[model samples]
Target: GSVVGGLGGYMLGSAMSRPMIHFGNDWEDRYYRENMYRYPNQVYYRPVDQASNQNNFVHDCVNITIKQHTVTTTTKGENFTETDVKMMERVVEQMCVTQYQKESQAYYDGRRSS
Candidate 1:
């Protein structure tokens, strides 16, 4: 779904077997499986190597407008507009960054006082 991208670092799996969390349409299930070659026809996102993926590292994204359509993931290294919620990828990344920062600060504060 729209929330799966909110993955916590230090996961319990790797690229071949990492738990995916999606709350939207085929954005997660279909896209991932499709790229993984699990379901070619059904899924379409062509799931990039999000985990440990040099290409999809996506340290930062650019060339995206508030309007729909025409989205790009710079870190993908592919240099193309990805479909299937590509418009929301950057937004999701922002949300995850915020969440990570908050969690990191909390964790540090917890240890500092411990």
Candidate 2:
């Protein structure tokens, strides 16, 4: 009797379970899937390399400001003015030179131990 009751319960449970039905228009689903494929993906790749000399390295650091100004000019459709160039030179004299000196001192201190 127990085995027969278990079998009957299993059959009833199976009959009660229903498959899920998604409610949406066919074109709505197709448009979304096509939109995803239309614009694959984008990425920006920058090559990595070491600087050749101190001057080049310092210039490379300074170029970051130049690049920023360039992009700003390009985006706004304007030329890089003389004042902008002068400000960047001041940045090199004030900030970049001090940083280079600090790094040079650190390098010397490190080399002295060995």
Candidate 3:
């Protein structure tokens, strides 16, 4: 289509007017598929199995926390001391311990190969 001066301002305005879309956690779905469930409370690696660590592979001190089995905070690698979690409970319902090192790592693995 022919326009005066190629309608330069209109095209620029359109690009600037576009809305910003965000992917906060939409990729979590795929992250779930790659890893069955993440070991929630672990910081970087899975805790050495009692039998597997028979030689004391790494850990020297193990602090005991109340309700160890029921607590998911440590399992998810999610720190709650500085952050409030009670309010986040409504959002994070269950804790799944998985093999992925980080949450984003699995998400990248889920991306389509280009």
Candidate 4:
């Protein structure tokens, strides 16, 4: 038992170095789960209903969309211009408008949720 605990250092690695691991039970698995969510571009939150200043919400959505969507396909070290920025803005705003229309249709069809 003593030998196992001593050698557990290398077996568990540095994660076990931290005292009182989170969630108590399944600390190792919980640690991994927490780390998984910490990774970027995996999830997003958006407003379900349109507001008076919903443009800001759409802008944020577009920003996240471009950041998450464009990194891999485009060439590295490329210069971005005002035209490029405006282009993405237009594209994302159109999508937002389309989503608004669909939302209206959904609500019209009695798809209400609380």
Candidate 5:
């Protein structure tokens, strides 16, 4: 009855915590740019699906690289806890996304006209 459900819950908790800790350690060094350039050389263009149009595609490309560098700089010379790392990660991501949208749009416009 209740005993079997309790055992199942314990097993689920054990499995979840393992990766939670592992990701916490790995997330610090995980660079989106490295992943894109390392495996499957075509990874850079894969985000095109996330884009709505040509403009969105350009924005996504710039945003990806910008966020990568942001994470790289934030993680440098600092040993942060998992929660702290993830908080900073989200902050950088949002900032880059907002900033790059406009920058990439301008670049695309200039290239298109020229």
Candidate 6:
């Protein structure tokens, strides 16, 4: 088994031999979440974006956009002016701030109901 930076490309080694795919298991999630958030208690419990398999998955699902424009001037006016403006905004939601305790039964129940 071979791996690289946090969520970079990875190699699984020889194909002739048996391969171990730890799919559906939280081992990777646990490793990252634990190691990445290792700090004092007060610090650990502080505001944090809890890691998940989605974190690693989203790394490959980047949103790419491309735009192109062309202009041709024929026998037209004496002077011409061209102006273009573009704007983009991306809003990401990874966590919600609430007073409810996440580990409590009510939390899970409310989450399921909603």
- Best candidate per TM-score, number? 2
Instruction: Please give, for residues 60-104, the per-residue lDDT of candidate 2 as tens digits.
Output: 545543454444464588575554454444444334444555555
Clashes of each: 6, 0, 13, 0, 0, 0
lDDT per residue (tens digit) for residues 60-84 in model 1 = 2211121112222343343433554
Q: Give the range of the ten consecutive residues with the poorest summed lDDT in model 4.
A: 9-18
The worst-scoring run of ten residues by lDDT in candidate 2 lies at 9-18
lDDT of 4 at 15: 18
Tell me the spans in candidate 6 whose CA falls farther than 4 Å from its real position: 1-38, 43-105
Ranking by TM-score: 2, 4, 5, 1, 3, 6
lDDT of 3 by residue, 32-110 (tens): 4333232123211223332323122112111111112114454567454312322122112221112222332445555
Model 6 C-alpha RMSD to native = 21.5
TM-score of 3: 0.16
Candidate 6 per-residue lDDT over residues 1-114, each given as its tens digit? 212222123211111211122224476434433432221111001111333233332222111110101111212331212211111101011111111123233335544655
TM-score of 5: 0.31
- Return the TM-score for each candidate structure: 0.27, 0.40, 0.16, 0.37, 0.31, 0.14
RMSD of each: 13.1, 30.3, 22.5, 21.8, 17.0, 21.5
In model 6, where is the ten-residue run with the lowest total lDDT?
A: 84-93
Off by over 4 Å in 1: 1-84, 111-114
Residue-level lDDT tens digits of model 4 in 41-96: 22122434444244654555565545543443244654444444444444445555
Q: Sort the candidates on lDDT, descending order.
A: 4, 2, 5, 1, 3, 6
- Where does candidate 3 have its weakest 10-residue lDDT segment? 10-19
Consecutive 10-residue window with the lowest summed lDDT within model 1: 38-47
List of clashing residue pairs for candidate 1 = 1-22, 1-23, 1-24, 2-23, 2-24, 4-21
Q: How many residue pairs of model 5 clash at the backbone?
A: 0
Error of 3 at 51 (Å): 41
lDDT of 6: 0.21
- Of the two candidates 3 and 4, the one with more favorable TM-score, higher being better, is 4
Give every collision pair in model 5.
none
